[PDB]
């Protein structure tokens, strides 16, 4: 997370992606404080709430209201593709399969033809996954391996919780 801190302040645009990690780890409550802080810094934040991600439709949408995250920055399944390219630190809070190329580009993942958030080769895609483990697949997707698209080997809450005070 010590990286992700410096990375955040660099970003200008930040896509926060709520895919499962957010919810399970309660990372939505602390995210609300840090995003508010990023807002004060002047950072173009977009939450990309793709519904079909991990567990149940909506869910994390109202969980962000619980966290008291503004619905202005909550973009629910808005295909904010052009901002995706413009974004530097995409905080992929878990969410690997919801952004997984091998689900649509390759018809390969069990989630057959998943409309994944096309954020590969953005400016940075820090995928909060504590291991290269199978999500609903995550077969061979550059989001695991690459330099900008890379697995942050930390928990969803834990990583947010450090960057919350670090930044």
């Amino acid at each position: 997370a010590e990286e992700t801190a410096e990375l955040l302040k660099n970003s200008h645009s930040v896509i926060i992606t709520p895919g499962y990690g957010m919810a399970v780890a309660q990372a939505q409550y602390p995210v609300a404080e840090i995003t508010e802080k990023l807002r004060a810094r002047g950072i173009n934040v977009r939450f990309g709430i793709h519904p079909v991600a991990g567990r149940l439709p909506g869910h994390m949408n109202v969980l962000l209201a619980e966290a008291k995250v503004p619905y202005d920055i909550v973009l629910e399944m808005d295909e904010i593709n052009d901002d995706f390219a413009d974004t530097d630190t995409v905080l992929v809070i878990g969410a690997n399969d919801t952004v997984n190329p091998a689900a649509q580009d390759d018809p390969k993942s069990p989630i057959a033809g998943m409309p994944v958030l096309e954020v590969w080769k953005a400016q940075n895609v820090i995928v909060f996954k504590r291991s290269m483990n199978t999500g609903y697949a995550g077969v061979q997707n550059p989001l695991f391996f690459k330099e900008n698209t890379h697995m942050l080997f930390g928990d969803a809450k834990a990583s947010v919780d450090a960057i919350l005070k670090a930044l």
Binding site: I49, H50, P51, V52, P57, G58, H59, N61, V62, A65, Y71, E76, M77
Partner: protein, 366 residues
């Protein structure tokens, strides 16, 4: 014999019974014999053998009336007055300020008339306070029948295709019913809001999960003021642009509900929306409200004046009315024992005891 009689509600199109099986059990515990009419709860889905599950004597028709406690679910109609017996602890929704005629009539029947609506509205008494418990249930149920006719979800959610926005619910005239309506909408995941003159309710509104809309401006003097009714109508004009549910709540016992929202402004409200008028059982706080119906305002605000709302959630209203009645009979049968010790020094009981054994004892120490 000290037998509690649980009737069916024989008022036309009321949906309660006095007690559900679970609550009948609680009346057994009280040390009285408990008899329920032949399948009295079928309005609220519980038959004879369902009350045999609780362990209730199924009094076969009229023998229900021959009992020293009759937990009537609403007022006796003259039919039932004739059926009542003197000396009986007739514990019911009497509505004394709405029913001075009934007061004179039950005085002639010489009954101990305990008006369940007329409990002193204080902390300790809230468990006995049927007025507020049924209002509370009706508040929850107003939110229900609002989602029955609502265009949208309360529950904001991105679905596999599209965004559902969280609904904006404005409760207006926040009685206890309004507070529970906030709790209901909040459980469903709606942006809840509330307005009333009285600052006492705000604490609860904020807690159960809502924005208490300030009067963009004593409490009675304020409430009467012309600029105040302007200011209310400005809060209403403002919310009309955005809201999804309005719950019109300010029901007064006796007085018809103040017609707050002028018809014009309802037409101006955001369409695909509901105004559930709880206050519809006397007057109703919207001016559109024809009691009984869903009047769809031509924009698409269905002003649902369901007068029968406290009835409408049948087993709940029965369960909790039953629990208010058990609560009363707890302090009425403190020893157990099983004898109706009607208290006077306990001023809340002195409240509810609007008539005792003939002589009208209404009103009561405030």
């Amino acid at each position: 014999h000290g037998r509690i009689g649980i009737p069916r509600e024989r008022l036309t199109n009321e949906t309660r019974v006095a007690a559900t099986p679970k609550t009948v059990e609680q009346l057994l515990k009280l040390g009285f014999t408990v008899a329920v009419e032949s399948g009295a709860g079928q309005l609220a889905s519980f038959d004879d053998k369902a009350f045999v599950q609780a362990g209730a004597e199924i009094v076969e028709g009229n023998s229900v009336w021959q009992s020293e406690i009759i937990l009537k679910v609403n007022a006796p109609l003259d039919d039932e007055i004739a059926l009542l017996n003197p000396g009986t602890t007739l514990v019911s929704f009497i509505w004394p300020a709405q029913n001075p005629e009934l007061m004179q009539k039950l005085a002639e029947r010489n009954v101990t008339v305990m008006a369940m609506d007329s409990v002193p509205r204080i902390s300790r008494a809230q468990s006995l306070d049927a007025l507020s418990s049924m209002a509370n249930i009706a508040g929850y149920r107003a939110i229900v029948e609002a989602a029955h006719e609502f265009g949208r979800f309360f529950t904001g959610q991105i679905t596999a295709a599209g965004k559902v926005p969280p609904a904006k619910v404005m409760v207006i005239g926040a009685g206890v019913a309004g507070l529970a309506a906030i709790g209901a909408a909040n459980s469903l995941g709606a942006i809840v809001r509330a307005f009333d003159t009285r600052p006492e309710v705000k604490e609860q509104v904020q807690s159960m999960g809502a924005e208490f809309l300030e009067l963009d401006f004593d409490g009675y003097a304020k409430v009467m003021s012309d600029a105040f009714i302007k200011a209310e109508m400005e809060l209403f004009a403002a919310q009309a642009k955005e809201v999804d549910i309005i719950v019109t709540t300010a029901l007064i016992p006796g007085k018809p509900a103040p017609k707050l929202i002028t018809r014009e402004m309802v037409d101006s409200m955001k369409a695909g929306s509901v105004i559930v008028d709880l206050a519809a059982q006397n007057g109703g706080n919207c001016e559109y409200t024809v009691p009984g119906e869903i009047f769809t305002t031509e924009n698409g605000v269905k002003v649902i004046g369901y007068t029968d709302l406290p009835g409408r959630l049948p087993t709940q209203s029965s369960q909790l009315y039953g629990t208010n009645l058990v609560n009363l009979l707890k302090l009425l049968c403190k020893e157990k024992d099983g004898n109706i010790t009607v208290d006077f020094d306990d001023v809340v009981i002195r409240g509810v005891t609007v008539i005792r054994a003939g002589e009208i004892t209404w009103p009561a120490p405030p």
